[model samples]
Every structure is written in C-alpha cells, then in structure tokens.
Target: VYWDLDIQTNAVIRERAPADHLPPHPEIELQRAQLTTKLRQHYHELCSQREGIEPPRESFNRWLLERKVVDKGLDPLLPSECDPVISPSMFREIMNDIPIRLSRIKYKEEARKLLFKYAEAAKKMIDSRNVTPESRKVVKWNVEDTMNWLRRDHSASKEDYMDRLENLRKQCGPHVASVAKDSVEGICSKIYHISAEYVRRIRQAHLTLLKECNISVVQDRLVYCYPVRLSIPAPPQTRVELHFENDIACLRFKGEMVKVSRGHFNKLELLYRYSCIDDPRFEKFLSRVWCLIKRYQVMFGSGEGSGLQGSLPVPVFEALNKQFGVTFECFASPLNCYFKQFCSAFPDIDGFFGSRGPFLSFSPASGSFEANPPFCEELMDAMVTHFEDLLGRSSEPLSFIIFVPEWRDPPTPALTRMEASRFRRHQMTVPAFEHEYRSGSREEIYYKAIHGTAVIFLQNNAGFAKWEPTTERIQELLAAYK
Candidate 1:
C-alpha cells in the first residue's frame, strides 16, 4: 500500500494498494526517500545557477538596432552612431557562439532546443515589425501611430496611451530640446514596449525549461526507479453457482454468496466464462468479483462515493426530459445518474459492463436516451457505430441526444459520421465557458466547462415529432445550466 500522510498530524490523506497485496520492503522505502531528497536538492541547485546569470544586454541591443532599421528604413549598420550597430544576422551569429554551459544536465539537448526556439521567435517578432509573418509590413510609426500601436498590443485604451504621452510631453516642456522631443518620446515608447515584451518571453522560456527538467526527474528517475513486487498466488479449485430470486441474481463461490442486481449479473456473466469454474483464470476472476462487491458495499453506505466526470447538472437533465422525454442515460455512474435506467462502465456500480455494454453490444428496441460518453476518439467511434446499428435494425421511435466536445483540430470521424447521418434531427454547439457540469471532485458541486459542447440529436421520424429541437427550445435548455 502507498499512503500519503500529513507529516505534522500523522493523518492519512490518501492511500492506494492492490487487493491482497503485501506492503513495500523497508529497503525500497529508504531508497525512495533518498531519491526524493536528491531530486529536490538538485532542482534547487539548477535554479540557483539560473538566478546567478544576468539577462543578455547584447541581444537587447541587437533588437533595438533591428527595430530602428525596419521601422525607420535606416541602414542595416549605423556606422555614424557613437556605438556602432551591427547587422541582425551578424548579431545572431555572435549570440549563437555564446554557451549556456548546461550541457552536463541530463536533459541538456531539450533545454538547449527550448532556449533556441524562444530566441528565434524573439528575432522573428522584431524582423516582422511586431506583426505576424503573413501580414508583415514595414510601417513607420509617428506619435499618433505609436500611441495606437500601444493601445492594441498592450490591451489598453487609446485614451490611456494618449494620457501617458501627454504626461511625458509636460515633463519635457521647459527644455529647449522639446522642439524634436516628441519624436524622441515616440522612439523611447517603442523601445520600452519591445524590450518589455522580449524580457517576458525570455523569462517565460526559463520557467518552462525549469518545469520540464523537474517533470523529467519525477517521471523518468523517481517513478521508473520504484520497486514493486507482483505476487500471483497458485490457482485454487474454484466452484461457482448463479441463480435468480426476487428480481436479483445470487452468485456463490468459496462457501460465500453475493446478491447483485440482475443487470449487473448479466454483464458479469458476459465478461467471464463462469462455465469453466475449475479453470485457473476463473479463480482470479472470482477474487476480483468479490473484491468489487465488498468495496462497493462500504462505498454505498459511507455516502463518500468516487466523483464521476462529465455529469450534467440536475436542472439540465430536468429540461432535457421535459422536452425530449429522455428516459435513459447511455453513459453514467450510479452516484451521478439522473435516470434510474443508465449504463455505466463498472459492473460494481448497479449497471451493465462490456459485451453487454452500452457502447459495444447492448441494443435498445425503442427508447429516448442521452449519451455523454467520455471524450475518447476510439470509444466515440465505436459509440457512433453502435448508434448507427441500433437505428438501422428497428423502425421503432428511438432517439439519442448525444453530447461531445467540439474537437475539430483534425476533425474526429465520430463527429463527422453523426453529423452526416440521416437520423440526425438537429445539431447545435454551445461555446466554452457558457455552461457548467457537475464537478468531478468531492469539494465542488459544479465546474465551469472549459471546452465547447456539441449537442447532436439522432431521432427517427416518430421521435422527431415528439421532441423537435427548435431554436427557442434549445435556448431554453441552454439557459437551465447557466
């Protein structure tokens, strides 16, 4: 067992262990502690080295010269200036020669690549006149032009930029140099803007590098070095008997009997071959079955159940049922389910499991249901196939209101198939942060959704007439979550 405890109070925060597993060896425990301390000490040492190094002023000088050449249409090298300016390419060559001296670190190659990527982006930003590559243009900036640029780039109002410029003007009013001082002030403003942005990028790159290094130590060194022993006991002569009574299924093994819901028993029978009771694999299977039953017995009574992700709010369900008569859930857990008739991933949770599962084998004759399956591409593809098959087999009034994330980066096949299906009645996309879902944590009740939700209705002709996904009705459904 692995127990996470509070050091001061000696209170156990969390625990993870396999059923009938032995505790870790003392030597292994000591080794883990030593490795943890070494990782922390090494991280701090690297950070100290990073902090000692100053920002590269030479790079900043190059950026300033590049800005002058591009924005003012000046020569590449300003030989007339007191401090002679070099070409941007020459400066790049010089900067490339400077060593970061972190080659001794295990992740030196990745760290070097990240730093180079940041430097390249910084150079590109300056070369393109602070605009994106496609829209690159060498536009000269006057006082008003710079003010407008600051407003847009800095996310400040134009009035705010004007006010600051006016204050600078007031400061230089008494000096005779004020004649050409407005132009100088504009140049100074531009410099400060580019310098601040460049510094932020550099700082961000350093922090990201440190984070990646820390993650590597934890994932590669600590976790990979963990010592674990797998003890698989010799198979016992297992005898099993199953029977039904009072709408419940009774399963018996090893002189002990467990009563589970009939639906759950059907799923369990489908998952493993109970006919071969004497088989070696059946012994392990029966052990896991009993373990689940015992585990859930305590969980159901304790009122402290595991959180289920992607569960809709109560009001959202009420609204869906009111409009579409959604009587079943294709994907749900017993603890977070809105309807009594719902399919879940686990057999322990008052629901059916694989082969008899919702997404793979189980078929409904006629029903209006809601499906909010987990956002996995493979699972979703299977679900879409299941829906297509169910719709094709029977001419009954079957309908499914499916909800999935709007994943169009490289367009998922499931979303495309569902959209093109003849059974699809209506489809609407709810923008991200516009709705909330039941939180997948014990501490919170509701979590604001971070991804845009696509609600698709798959209904036959008869089902469509019962619940037409009208614009006003969809709006009403969306309002309930808000």
Candidate 2:
C-alpha cells in the first residue's frame, strides 16, 4: 500500500482527468503561451463565479482541478516479497525510447491522397502499349506495402500500440520536463557544471512540445534516443536524468564505448503504490493538507522556519510520516535530513560516511563510528572498523545497513577484502533495469542496450538485531544481478 499526502490532488488532477484531455503533448507554445495567458485572464471571472459557494483559494483549486483529490500514502508498501520483476518491454517503454514502430505515421487522408496519385501514374503506364499487365501489378503492390508500413503500429503484444505510446508519452513528458528545467536551474544555482550551448539548445524544447498536435511529430519523439546531444554535451543532464541510479553508463572522449552512452537503455522500476481501490479511506487520509500544498503551504506544516524554508521540507516530511507515526522537522538535504530522523528514531542504528562528498553520512545517536573512509573502499572497511571498535564499547548487538554501489571493487579491493564478511554474505539485489522506463528512439542514435541495477544488501555482524532485505525488484534482481 502507498502512504501519500496528496491522494486527492494526485487522483483528481492526474487520475480523474480525461486520459487524453491534455493528450500526449500539451502544445507547449499553446500551454506556455495560450493556456497560461487565458488562465490569467479568466482568473477574476472564474473566482467571481465561485465566490459564494467556495472561498477564494478553494474556488481557485476546484476550478483548476481536473478531478477530485486522492491520497497515496495511506497505504504503505507490502512486504518485500511482494515486489515483482516487471516486464522488460514495459520498462523499456518508459525509460528509453526504443521506437519499435515507424515514427512517420501516415494518416488515412495522406495515404488516400498518395493512393490516387500513384494509381493515376500507374494507369498511364498500363495504358501505354509498351507496358505489361505485370508492371501494373508490381506498381500497385509496392504502393500498398508502403502505405501499410507507414500506417501500421509496432508496439509488442503487451499493449495496444496507441495506448502504449500514450502512456509512455505521459511519463516521458514529466521526465523530460524535469530534466530540462532542472538542468538549467541546477547550473544557474551552481550545483553542477553544464555548458551554455546545452542550456540554449535545451531552452527551445518547447518548440518540439508544440509539434505534438501533428501525430507525425509526436511519433518522431520516439525515434531519437539522445537528441539532447545535438548541441549540448551530457554533463549535468546525465546526473539529473540518473538521479535514481547507482551507476551511470557513458562513453569516454574516445567514444568507442558510445554504445553504452547512446543506445536505447531502459531502467526497470518495481516500486509500488496503492491501487485506487486498495483502501477505502486512503483518499481521506491526508485531505486536510490538500489546500495547503496547493495554497501558500504554511498551514499545518513541518518546517520550523518561514516562507520557502518551511515549504521545501514538506516533500520529505510527508514521505516519512507513513514510515513512522512521529512527526519530523528538517532543514538539511533531503537524504541527510530524513536519515537523521531514522538514526534518531532507532537508538541501535549506526552508520558511517562514504567518500562521495560524504553523501552517505550516517548519524547514529549514541553509537560509535570510525575511519578516514576513502569513499572508494569505505563500504567493507567501515563495517569492519565498526566491528573492531565494538569490543568493550557496549553490549547490544549492531544492526547495520550501509548504502554503497553493489559492485565495482576499488583498486584497493584486497585491502577492503579484509573487511569483507566471509561466511555470511547475503546480497539483496535491486534489479534496476527492471524498474526503469525505456528510451526515446527518435533522437539520433537507435540501437540500444538495457542495463541491470541492484543494491547489494550485505548484512553483517551488528550489535542490535536481525536485518531483513526489503527490495523493490526481487526476482529479476536474482536473475540479472547474478
């Protein structure tokens, strides 16, 4: 089950809205220019219409809402065993755009137009005394085949091609939207290094968004895999796109390994949310906060600060509420902030900082931590170091969970091997490709490869308790990660 705070909003706006109301593409020139302006212009009139029945804010919210709100988090994740190995075809549909179907769709009208033109041309050839009947048949066959190829859809048996395209397009729109906007924002904010050429090339993506009305253009999007590389190099765009990844595959300047960087590689996904019918009361679980998130976002919030500070933490804040009944206030990075709460909640939990900018900093309450930790060989060493220091420190057993890339031994693997647990090695695989969406084939490069991902769960000697592996992608993880 999913525990969500915005079930009502997510359902009403995302679910109840007509499946194809906004359709695959929102005519960016139209949405950004026309809809935006029209929304602003109608603001007063719409508000005045709802003045008596609803307040100003609620009126605005209801008017904009395509459907009623429904919360997701009221239902939490089922036991890890419930995680299923999703189909690769489905994963590819979402992660990478590997166009199985020809992008240049031929509308019936166009096909008919071409048919008459070709028929006229063929009739003349047939009328000529020099032409054979065989020639006319050959010409007619070629025309029909060409037309069929253009109009035929190519999605696998898993779904109707049009429906599949529509679903994938829906997911890709947000995925692309975030990458474009965040790439620029991340750069201007100085979080990562991206080139200006990339910024400008990405800036005009809206033009393509406007092209969606023409089904041919919509289909063209699926043809290319890495269209962004036309003008911009992949620096920060890769990072933003790979936010949920453990390792990213890219080509070096030599670019022979360009296959990994360019081909259609779809990441699989296994995370589950509650179904619309999972819980009768799920929608009402957090309806109280619906207006808040949509509004200025101050009412009944977790932040211990003002305006933006209070609001920024809500995303993580709402995430943790379902994990534990306790409320939390965070001011740190989303990762560290939530981990801080987890460390504080469980007294027995202990962790260490990894070398990636200490991205894996563990904050244990009273437990001891150690090591100069090279992020390279820190995983095994950190665990062993904690064990070495454990003697004479406390009596409770240690329950450990360290976040590290599953494989890829550093140069000093031998040194780190000393810390590697020998008898008890229980690896919990994450099965990433099974969890990721497919690639877009429309960009430039076409042939694609799928990459497998898994978080190796290593439970070693600890002071407190048993550690159970809770993985999202369990079966393919065993199948692929092996």
Candidate 3:
C-alpha cells in the first residue's frame, strides 16, 4: 500500500482505498510500492538516530506533510554520502587560488624556458634539412613533399594553402611550446617576451643580409605590423611585400604570394623561388630565415603590437567624464578601457565579437569622445580628415578630444591640418617624459611617453558652450597625467 501527505489535516492518508477504488495498473502499483519502501526506510533511519525511545510516527508524518506542502512535491533528499566533500566556500577558495598559482614567477620562467628550447629545436631541424623515418611517422607528412606541392603549384586556391598551412602546424605541434595554459594573463606575458626576442634577432640578422643582397627594407610606419617592403635592384625590379596576417607571414611578389607558418623551411625556399634570387649569400640568409617568420608569428599572432593605442589613466578619464561628459572611446580595445562603448581595430578579438567595429567605420552624430589613435602617420592623416568631416556634418553637440604624437621631423600633415581647423578651441603640447599613458597590456603598467604628446580639442558651438576648456580645468587635467 502507498501513502501521501495531507497538509490541511496534517496527516498521512492511503493513496488508494481498496474498497472504494479499482486497483491501479501494475506499473503504477510498482512505482507506489517503491516510493512506500523508500519512505519507510527513511522513517526507520530517523527513529534509530534517537536514544532508546523512538519518535511518534504521527509527528514524523506531520513533518513530511508540511515539507511536501511547502515544496509542492516530494524532493529526492540527498544522503550523507551524496553531500559534497568540500564546503561551498572552500570550493570557491580553491578555484580562486588556481589562477594565482599558474601566474607565479616560477611558472612563467618555466614557460619561457620551454618556448626558447622549442624555438632552438625548430631552428636545428631547419638547419639539418633531414627528418628520420621515425619522426616522419609521428607527423604523417614529409616536409620536402609538402614544400614541393607549395612551390610547384602556382594556381592553388587560398583555402587549399590554408589547409596545408594548418596541416604543417599539426605536424610541428611539438615546436609550439605552451605552459600555464589555464592562465590567459600568464600565457600572454610568455608570448610577449618570446616575440620580443625573435623581433630583436630578426632585425639584427636583416641589417647584414640587406647590404649583401643590395636590397633596402623600408618599414611601413602606417600599419600595425610595421610591414616591410624589399626594394630589389632593377633588372627584374622586383618589390616583395612582407606583412603578418594573423599568425601567418604573408610574402607577396608581383601578383604571386605564399602564406606559411613560422620557422618552416618552405617559407624561405618559396620566397627565394618567387624573387628569382641566385646569390651565394642565399644559403647564409636561409639559415637565419626562421627568426623572421617566428617574429611575425609570435608578435602578430598574439596581437601584441596591435593594441598599441594606449589610453589615459583612470583618474584622467574619470575627470574627463565628470567635466565634459566623455563616454565613448574612438580608439580602444576591451582589454584597455573601462568604457562600455569603444572602437577597436580587430573587433572580433578585442571588442564584444561582432557588436563593436573599428573607429574608421564608426558613425556617431552627437557625443563627446576621446581618441588616442596608434602613432601611425597615415592613420592619423585619415583620422584628421574624418574628424573634420564629422564636425562639418553634425549640427548637434558633437565633440572630440584627440591625442597624437608630436612629429616635426618633416612636419606631420595631420598636426598641421588639426591646428588650422576652425573648430579647434584649445591645444596643449605635453613635453616628453612629463606624462604617462596606461600601457594597453594584459597587465596594469604605464608607458612613459618617448616623444612629446599633443592634445587637441575640436568642438562645435553647442559643445564649446557646455564644456569650456578653462585654464583651471586644463591645469586639473595636467595634474592627473602624473
């Protein structure tokens, strides 16, 4: 027989009356019998816990009735064995301690050492140009066979090349060392140092190699990667463009190009083939080529230099917000600022995925914004042009506070244009090393200005009246820079 809790009467009643009601189906009867058995076991267990005397069955039934009424149904009670071994507070503490442990100096040092060792091993493999059959079995692809495919086929689709590139990464998985996988901050720091080392080595290697090839490497000041153009002497008069697209080193000669992974011998061989170079110094250059590709992979792959548009300190932004109602950042990433609204170059990586886009495409009719664009002359030129256009079109209270590096070598066109604009209310030049910017890194560090910084104010009639750039207010702003 089965029983149920009756809340109103505070009693236990038979679920079915044998005389008044027909017997239920066999399945239903079996379920009721199982429930009754469980309830009886619970009742006896509770009674045994008491001293020699057992608790009244009616009281126990009443307590169950009230519990069922409160819950609206019987809940599966957890036994002592089912309870968590650790308390909720202790579990949280353990979870919180994990990041701290992974980010320790010792773990970071280990990660760095492991990465360096991997890099050296990769360099050795490229130099030897020999892979044992045992190692070939591990990768399931021959390096020479993959290279032949890349060099022989000029009509291969981009998708096909990418498939091969990914395969190459899979084959050389051991070369890309990783530690502190659980801590993003720690991993970022490790990659940053490794990238810095590779960039240093590549630059040192390039200095001597360029002279020997009779080529001039012109570094682009506009792009985030600072991409280089190799000006080869006329005969064929080839100009090879070298830049990073995500983790791949993109080398374009004429209309032909090759995209390959870092530290792979194929990238160097393909480059030589594309440029049609037949010099004796080529062998020497090939030995040092891995450093070039590795530098691009580590630096651009992790987006280390891409977020170089540093922001003003917290107090500075807070003051700007309080005094001028600045709420939007024209150039910033999610990693850099506390602003709810901001624009970044790679919105998919830096912003809330696809929700926010770059500064160049962002359109706002009216609002105060702070812009500290990357110190790229071409980008600044375009930025100034865009600012002028926005100010001209908007009738509402739209304003912008812009920061640019003070460049006067040949005189920057952007600086000249901004100074001449009619909307420019105030402009101040802070001397080099006088003020600091929040270094847009994963960590909380400051980047002391290497060159003088120029702050410009552009506002319409309505914006100018609302927030006047007074001498006292300017002084207050300058104080926060420290």
Candidate 4:
C-alpha cells in the first residue's frame, strides 16, 4: 500500500509501516518536508500580510466610469467589512490547526460544498468543449485568472480555454480521484487526490486575494474559499443529497428574481435545506434555537438530531397562554402546524410569522402574547431586550409570556438579570421541559424531554403575579391542555 499524509498533523503513514519509520525513502521524506515547509511558510506570511499592508484602492477613473455604466449616478452598495478576516479567532484557528487537525465536525459541511465548487471550476476547463453554450456566459474569477496566468491571448474560445487548462495541469500537475460520472465529479475526484498541503496553499492564496484585491462583489463571493479540512473516511451519512442540476442557486420567491449570486456552489446547503423565519426581529431567535437543537442532538442523540424530526412541543405554548392570556405565537416554522393546533388555539391571534419568509418587523403586538422561541442564547438575549422595550413603549397594558431554559449560570448577562425587571420568573423542574411527547401515525410513539425550561411572564403596568409554578401544578396545567 502507498502512503497517505495525516490531514491534521501532516504526519505521513502507509499501511503496515512502522508508527514512525520516516517513510524509508529519502525522496518521500524530502517531498513531505517540502510540503510541510510550504504550508507553514504560507500560514506565517498570511498572519503577517495584514500587519503592514493597506489593501489596494480601486482606480479612481474606473470607479467613476462604472457609475456611467448604470442609469442612476448613485454609488453602489458594498459590504461594511472589506477586510475578509471574518474574525480574529478564525485566523488564530488556522494558525493553531497547522500541526493538529482542523475541526472535522465544524468544517465537514463546508469542505463537502467546496469539493463541489473546485470541481465545477475544473469541469469548465476539462469539459470546455461540452460546457453547453448557456453556461459559457457564467464566469468565475478563477477561470479568468487561470487564463491570464497561462498567458492565453484574447482568442477566449473554448479551444483556448482547454489549452490554458491543459497547460496548468501539465505545469502544476494537480492530483485527482473519480467518484461521479459527471464532469463535476471528475473535477472533485482530481482535487480529492491532490496533496492536502496543496489544498491548504490554495486556501491561503484565495484568502490573500480577498484581502489584497479591491473589494468587489465578485471577490466578496470568493471570500469563503478559505481552507477547511475534512475527514477522509467517507461514511454513507456523508453522501450529499443536494443536486445543483447544472447550477441552480438563486435568491427568488413567488417567481420573482429577488437576488442573484456568483457563488452558486458555495451556498448549496442553505439554498437546498434552510427554511428561514421571516421576521428580522425573530431571525436571531430562530438561528439560536437551531443551534441549541443541534448542540443537544450531538450531546444526546449522536448528531442524528441534526434535522427536524418532531415539531416543538404544543403543550408548552398552551400552558403559557392559559396562565398569561397570551394572544400570539410570534416565531414558528409554519403558519399551519402539524395538526393546526396553533391556529385552533389562537384563532384570533394577531399574527403568525412562519417560515413563508419575512412577515414584518418583530414588535410586541398590543395584547397578551406568547413566544416559545427557539432556545437559542442569541434569541434569548434579544427576547429579554424586546420584553423590556415593549414594556417601556406600550400605551395600553399588555402581558407577555416567554419560555426559556433556566441555566443556573446563564450564558448571557441579559438572562442573568431578566427576573430583576418587571417580569416574574417561574422556574420549572428539570422534568418540566423534558416533558413526554408523542409522534407518528396509526400508533403514536412517545419521546422524552432532554432539557429543563422556565417561563417568564409580565403584564405591562400591572402588579406582581405569582412567581412560582411547581412541577405538579405545571403538569396539572399541561394535563388540562391534553
């Protein structure tokens, strides 16, 4: 058997080889050392690149000329943070992971999407003859970069494209493997076989390009091309179910072209799988809820709870409403749920912002309202602020009921100080949130709770309500709903 490099530590090992034999051959160890040095050197340069560098400014004449291109003389919108270093911690992460392995769990999905991406670029080169006249219009920064690097003249024909691609392959000699029959498959297979160090360098080069290149819309999309390593052992679970079917990513709704993207392959997961809550106020709320679900699923269900299995517990909403005269369910996945339970209960509800997209800005409706928002910390913090803001601003008195886990050591400072305000907290036992629920058809199957939760309630301009609800009393309240 041949040798393979450890993706994390960059250690080389082959089947039946000693734990550390130095690979026996001088050339083998020499190549490994060269690769290691190359990656380390690149990583070091990236860290320092930002220290003394002022990113290049766009040509002033060309910038003005672009305004003439548009009918309106208005300047175009741009992202606020031009420096593509999303966070300091991320840069430190790349530096720290040079010797150890990159996080397989955190970066797995990102790597798989990139696999599809690098392949698509390679396919345009390898299958230029069959790129179908339609996709020829689709241009990528790298494709043009490859042409300029190979010094291809302005012919810009498919034949010239192939020639430049072939030249790069000959000069660079990138490695590859085959998994699918499509051209994208061939491209991914080739990339999959390449040296890990080579991929890391590509990641570094892309990041440098993002920082140095005058921030443009096209370059902005390329920002995500940074390095994220993954596990080599492919499990059946890793099988990608997403199909682009010749590049089908777009931001659209109700047959309207809402937005366009150059990074088609990059957003494959969110495009195919995500169902976003419409309210901007509730956006952070929904996201954190998802984070909590995934967190516990991994902690409890071995990561199998990654996707939606059962709906949020209905009784939780009902009991809170009964206690506080709650009039609305602000954030939810759908307008009409599993059995229309939400609609049936609150037939005269002010609004239900389900995943149909954004409904309106999240403000407290003027009535008793119930929001069992996803148990995400960001949403929890936001909810605390929202409750306070509404109490401060409302003309007529209103009662609000919110459900959240009572962490002894709360994640947010807002949560720690929540009960100190007008709202009264009723902490439930560990079993309260781990309440039993049922699922399936023909015969309903039961599922147990995994977290403890509490309900915080307040009436705008009203006196103190009961601050206690025992497990037995809450269970009895829940039984009435049943």
RMSD of each: 22.8, 25.2, 36.0, 27.7
- Give the local distance difference test score of model 4: 0.32
Whole-model Cα lDDT of every candidate shown, in order? 0.45, 0.25, 0.44, 0.32
Distance (Å) between predicted and true CA of 233, model 4?
50
Top candidate, metric TM-score: 1
The list of candidate 3 runs beyond 4 A from truth reads 1-308, 349-355, 431-449
Segments of candidate 2 deviating more than 4 angstroms: 1-332, 335-394, 408-419, 422-425, 433-465, 468-482
Show where candidate 4 strays beyond 4 Å: 1-312, 335-360, 430-451, 463-475, 478-482
- lDDT winner, 1 or 2: 1
C-alpha TM-scores of all predictions = 0.38, 0.21, 0.36, 0.32
Clashing pairs in 3: none
Model 4 residue 314 distance off true place after TM-score fit, in angstroms: 2.4
The sequence of per-residue lDDT tens digits that candidate 1 reaches over residues 294-390 is 3333222212112112456566677777777776667754434454445554332132221112335345656677888654455577788889888
Root-mean-square deviation of candidate 2:
25.2
State the displacement of the C-alpha of residue 312, model 2, in Å, after optimal TM-score superposition. Answer: 21
Per-residue alpha-carbon lDDT of candidate 2 for residues 1-482, written as tens digits (9 for 90 to 100):
11122222100001111111111111221222233233334443422232111122222222111011111111000011111222221222222221111233345444344333433333343344243455445544554544454466752332233443344344333323333332223222221111122223323453344343332211222120000001111111111112212333332221111112122121101100111212244332122111111111111111122211111123323422332121222112211232221211111001110011121222221221212111223233444454334322433332232222334332234234433544123444332221112222111111110121222222333422333333432342243332
> Per-residue lDDT of 1-482 in model 4, one digit per residue for the tens?
00111111111111221111010111222233344344334434433342221211111111111211221211111111122212222222232221122222234344433333333545444353444343433323344565454454443444444444444333322222121124332222222223233534433443344344342211212111111111121111111122233333232222221111223223222221222223334323222222222222222221101111213355544554455444344444222132111211111111121121111223432455555543334334555776777667754545555555555542345457566775553533433343233221121211112344455655555312332345655675556433
